[model samples]
Target chain A: ELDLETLAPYIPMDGEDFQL
Target chain B: LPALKLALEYIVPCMNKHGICVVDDFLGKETGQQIGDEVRALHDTGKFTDGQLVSQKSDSSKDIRGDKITWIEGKEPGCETIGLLMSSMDDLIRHCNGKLGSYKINGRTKAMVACYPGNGTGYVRHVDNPNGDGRCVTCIYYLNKDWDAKVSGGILRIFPEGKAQFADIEPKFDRLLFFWSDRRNPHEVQPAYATRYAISVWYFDADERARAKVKYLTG
Candidate 1:
C-alpha cells in the first residue's frame, strides 16, 4: 500500500517531471 | 546503429525466445561507483523498508521474498544523486522505442532501488505484471561492489520460453538487465551470502498505469 503510492507518480502532463 | 544496440546484439540472445537482455559495464566504473556510494549512504541510514508481496487481490507474501526497497522520484528532493540514472533510462527508453518499433512501450513508467541483504535472502519465481498492470518491460541495474560469484549467491535465473532449461546470469556490478514483464519470461533471484543491491525500473502503457494504480490503491 505505502510502497505502491510511494512509487506511483502524480498524474502526468506532456512536459511533466516524469514524462519522456 | 547505437552502441547499446551493438552491445545488446552481441550479448543478449533473441528477445522473442527469452524476452531478456544483459549488458555488462553499462555505466563506466567511476559513475557506477558514485551512484553506488549514494545508495550505500541511504541504505546505511535505514531508509529502505522490507519489500512486500504485490497483487491487486492478494494479502501479502513476505515468505516468498526478503528484500528492502526505497522508491525514487524523478523530481523529488533528496533524489539528485540518482538524476544521472534517470537521464540514462530516459535515453534508453528512446533507444528501445526506436528499436522495438511497433513493439514500443507507452506511458511515463517508474523506477526504484532495491537491496537483497546477505545471509540466504532470496525471491521466488514471479512475473512483474501478473495482474495486467500494463507493465511492458523491466530493467535492473546492479551496484554490488567487489562481488565474487563464488562468495555471493545472488544470481538471476530466468526460465526460457516454454522450455525446461533455464539461463543463469551473475549479478555483477554495473550490469544492466532488461526483460519484458509478461509470463513468457519468469525469473527468480538466488539466495545470497553477501548483500546485493540494484535499481529496478518498469515501463507500462499509460492507460494501464492509471488503472493499475487505481486497482492497487482502492482494492
Candidate 2:
C-alpha cells in the first residue's frame, strides 16, 4: 500500500534544505 | 577488478535489497559536462516534447511528471557526447549483468533527455515499471552544474524497501543513479527551484523485436 506521509518528507519543510 | 568487486559486494546487494543506488562521477567529469551541455542546449532550442505521466510519448498535457523530454532513438545520428553515452551504457549493462545474476537485463536500452524546469516543477511519487513488461532497470544521469542544494529543490527521493525513511539524493552533476524498476522502489523528484537537467535510460529484459511485435499486433 502507498503511504503519503512517508513520501511527504521529500517535500521541503521550512528551512530544512539539503546541502553538500 | 577491485572496483567491480566493490560494486558486486556493495552496489549489487544494495540494488537487490533496496532497488536503488547512486554512483557519483560514474562517467567522469569532462564527459559528463560535455553531455550535460549538449542536453541543455537542445532543451534551449525547444526540442523536447511535453513530458507525460504514462510510459508512452506525448506532446500535450503533462499531468503527473513535469518535464520536457526528447528521446534518443537507438542508432540515431548524434554528436560525440551521445556516442560516448551509448558506449558507457553498453558497459553498464554488461557490468550489471555480471553481478546482478538473476536480475540481469537481457533487453534493449531506451534513452531520453529530461529537463525539470525551475519554479517548483516535479514529478509525484511513482514506480517506473508498474505494468512489469520486463522493464527491469531505471538509470538516470543528472546534469546540474554548480548545484546549490539550498534553494534548488530537484532532489531525487527514493523510498527504500521495507523502510520508512527515503534517500534524498542531490542531483549533482554527472551523478549516475540506477535502480531496479520494480514496485519496491517508489521514487519522486522534489520541486526544482532552478533548471535541473538529466538523461534517463531504461533497460528492459524483454527482447525488442518481440516487444515491438506485441505493440504492433495490439494496436
Candidate 3:
C-alpha cells in the first residue's frame, strides 16, 4: 500500500535518480 | 533493379560480460508499454516508493532509478532497452534454462536486464548477486544499432576488483556479455556521451542454505 500523498515529500525529481 | 530490403532483428538471448545467460526484448511492445505507462503515471506527482522510485544518478547516462523516469514521462527513449527479467515474469524462465539445466529451480532462477544512462557520470558498478544464494551469473546485451565508435558507446565494463578483468568492449548490438557477479567482483560505468542502453539479466541458483534478510524494498 503506497500512500502517494506521503511519498511526494521524500521523492526528489532531480538530475540522476535510480528507478530500480 | 535495386533488389534490397532492410532487416532489423533484436536477438532474444546471447552471451556477454562473464558468460552469464542473457534475455533480450523479453516483453513485446504491448506488454512493455503497459508496464512503462504504469510506472510513469505513478510518478506523475513525484514520489518514488519501492516498486518505482528515483535512484540518485551521479550523471546523466546512469540508470534512471525513479527520479529519471518520472521526469522523462516514460521509460527513457535512449534507455528503452528492456527484457522480461525474472524468468517467472515471462518467457525468460524457459529460454535461459540452458546451462543451468535440471538443477535450476523456479523461485531461485530469475533476473532482468537494465539500461544505464549517464546524466553526466558512469554508474557506480556492482554485481546484483551479493550473497551465496542463486545470484551467481550476470549478463549484458548491446542495443545500440549502427552507432558510431568516435562517439562513446555505453559499454558494460568489467573490473579488476576480483574475478572481473578491466576491459573496454566493442559495440555489437546483437552481442551479449556475461560474468560471475559477487560482492568481491565490483564494476562501474564510465560516463559516455549519449544514453548507454542495454539489457542486463541475472541467473541465480537459489539454495536452501541461503540466509533470510529483511527486504527493504518490499517492506
* Interface DockQ of candidate 2: 0.03
Off by over 4 Å in 2: A1-20, B1-10, B55-60, B74-78, B207-216
What does each candidate score in C-alpha RMSD?
Answer: 5.3, 9.1, 11.5
Per-residue lDDT for B69-177 in model 3, tens only? 2222224443232323222222333344433322242333212223333454344454444434344455554545554645664554666353434655543445445
Residues A1-20 of candidate 2 have per-residue lDDT tens digits of 74333222111112211110
Order of quality (DockQ): 1, 3, 2
Off by over 4 Å in 3: A1-20, B1-113, B160-165, B208-210, B213-219
Interface Cα RMSD, each model:
7.8, 15.0, 13.3
> Between the candidate structures 1 and 3, which one is better when assessed by TM-score?
1
- Best first by TM-score, ranked: 1, 2, 3
| C-alpha local distance difference test of each model | 0.67, 0.67, 0.37
After TM-score superposition, the amount by which residue B46's alpha carbon in candidate 1 deviates from its true location, in angstroms, is 1.6
Candidate that beats the other on lDDT, 1 or 3, i.e. the better one: 1
In terms of TM-score, which candidate is strongest? 1
Query: Individual DockQ of the candidates?
Result: 0.12, 0.03, 0.04
CAPRI quality level assigned to candidate 3 from its DockQ score: incorrect
List the candidates' TM-scores in order.
0.79, 0.79, 0.46
